Design a protein around this ligand. Structure first.
Ligand SMILES: Cn1cnc(Cn2c(=O)nc(Nc3cc4cn(C)nc4cc3Cl)n(Cc3cc(F)c(F)cc3F)c2=O)n1
Ligand SMILES: Cn1cnc(Cn2c(=O)nc(Nc3cc4cn(C)nc4cc3Cl)n(Cc3cc(F)c(F)cc3F)c2=O)n1
Lengths: 290, 299
């Protein structure tokens, strides 16, 4: 069976700081001479004018604590870019790439600048995540690692009226275009991550559970038109999926056909003990864990 | 309801690679001591029947090489060696300057801890497991993970509770407590060993049903009740642990208004299968969430 696995968090722990502006406080991320944090900390809340708020900021509007003097301030989308006079001596090698729905990443949950827990989520097709966050977590950070390069991909912003969560990429854009204000907002309807359901079926086949494999095939292009009408994402193949097809001898298109049948029901059978489709493990997860 | 682990940085700073002859695995560097599994002493002949007492006598301080790869790299010299149960206690001539405040305590079945999986002294992943009623854990471990460390954290104090030793069957593992005793009394040698049958951790199943009620999923709740004593007689016959209430569980009962005995009755109906229904996105009973975990996460 598959195990939820997160990256070691030490590297990122060393970058977490607390940012306070007026009576607001949250978490920031300190890289080199810059502290990133959500611009909501500038707000005195239901409909802020962040452009005016930025103008009103003065030399000592922000205070940064590591559990740091601010020399400049800028805004990049829904994030603030705060210049500090001391460079983080433990800045990892990093990139800022936006994650796509179905991709997994690790989250370091923090409160007032202190790391408290870590877990892994997949970005949902409706650009929310199913995290575990309490009040005081605004500015917590999500990331993947490739080699020793950290890709920072998520800065936490808000809990929606569901239990679901959203935030920003470090280019400043909010995932799913949610507005960083306290107004009722409703997410789009979620979908199954097709490529992840495919990975899970491959995991089943690797563990001896393969009754759903038939010779029938459904092409990618044909599955994708069906998916638009049945709350699945578009399937996009990857070399990681190809590796699963090679070591099982079962082609993607056989599994696309199987999903079409399984969406109707499992007949009277189980898959890896479950009678529901699973889309929270990626092809990369299955490759490295089986 | 996410699988939550402690931030791993405190423990990452203590992981080292330990080598002896042709064997290499992970060690834990705390002050002037490096802890690692004693299997690192075992030669290729005798991997199935080692004489660790004799192996230890044949060893010198010079038999052991120790490196720290991540963070500030490694100048460690072994100046002493001892064996404690299934663990080696190596003494080095530099005290780890990032040693956390720590304790050694053995965990009991049903309790959860974080694991930092490492390979050749390099941390690669973290996850949370529960100590199973048959004294195994179901982690994600590959070859080269022997000596990876499990732990909890309370305030500033890390409790180290697990040093990974062996894969018993696919996906089933065991290890030592830091007093050196193997969980489940498994033997640290290359031989097939059968484990006792696993059981559902009843108090964690109860915590999870409370989490479902808190989240608006309560179709399984009936007025009907089963007493603790009568449930525990049933559990003996159905591979469930004995239910033992705690203050953490009582908090959930007060908040939801649903008595423990109502959920004990519901478990008896739900192990007969969910019919076609789901609970918190699952079609089977879940027992890896503790009452403390549910109280923490759902407040
Ligand atoms: C339950 N929950 C789960 N995730 C979250 C995230 N979250 C948060 O941690 N804080 C928020 N509001 C603040 C209140 C403050 C009080 N002080 C003294 N300082 C504060 C700082 C913040 Cl950020 N919010 C709400 C929220 C945050 C935003 F970034 C935003 F644009 C709009 C919002 F309505 C929040 O969701 N809470
Ligand atoms: C798939 N898997 C999941 N968990 C494990 C744990 N595990 C392990 O990582 N290594 C082991 N044997 C070694 C071989 C070595 C080869 N070199 C060069 N160095 C080695 C070091 C070790 Cl420890 N084992 C097997 C094993 C380990 C013990 F500690 C023991 F007492 C008996 C055993 F059969 C292992 O289970 N692998």
């Amino acid at each position: 069976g598959l195990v939820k696995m997160s990256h070691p968090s030490g590297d990122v722990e060393a970058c977490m700081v607390q940012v306070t502006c007026g009576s607001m406080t949250l978490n920031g991320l300190w890289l080199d001479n810059t502290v990133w944090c959500p611009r909501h900390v500038m707000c005195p809340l239901s409909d802020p004018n962040y452009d005016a708020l930025l103008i009103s900021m003065t030399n000592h509007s922000f205070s940064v604590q590591k559990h740091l003097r601010v020399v400049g301030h800028a805004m990049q989308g829904t994030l603030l870019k705060l210049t500090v006079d001391v460079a983080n001596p433990s800045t990892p090698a990093y990139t800022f790439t936006t994650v796509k729905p179905g991709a997994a990443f690790s989250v370091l949950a923090c409160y007032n600048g202190r790391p408290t827990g870590t877990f892994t989520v997949v970005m949902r097709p409706n650009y929310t995540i199913k995290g575990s966050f309490l009040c005081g977590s605004a500015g917590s950070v999500g990331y993947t690692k490739e080699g020793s390069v950290i890709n920072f991909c998520y800065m936490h912003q808000m809990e929606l009226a569901n239990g679901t969560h959203t935030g920003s990429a470090f280019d400043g854009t909010m995932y799913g275009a949610f507005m960083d204000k306290q107004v009722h907002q409703v997410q789009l309807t979620d979908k199954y991550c097709s490529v992840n359901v495919v990975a899970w079926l491959y995991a089943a086949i690797l563990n001896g559970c393969a009754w759903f494999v038939k010779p029938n095939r459904t092409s990618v292009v044909s599955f994708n038109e069906w998916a638009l009408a049945n709350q699945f994402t578009e399937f996009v193949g990857t070399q990681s999926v190809d590796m699963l097809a090679v070591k099982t001898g079962v082609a993607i298109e056989q599994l696309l056909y199987a999903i079409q049948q399984l969406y109707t029901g499992f007949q009277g059978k189980q898959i890896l003990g479950s009678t529901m489709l699973e889309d929270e493990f990626t092809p990369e997860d299955v490759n490295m864990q089986i």
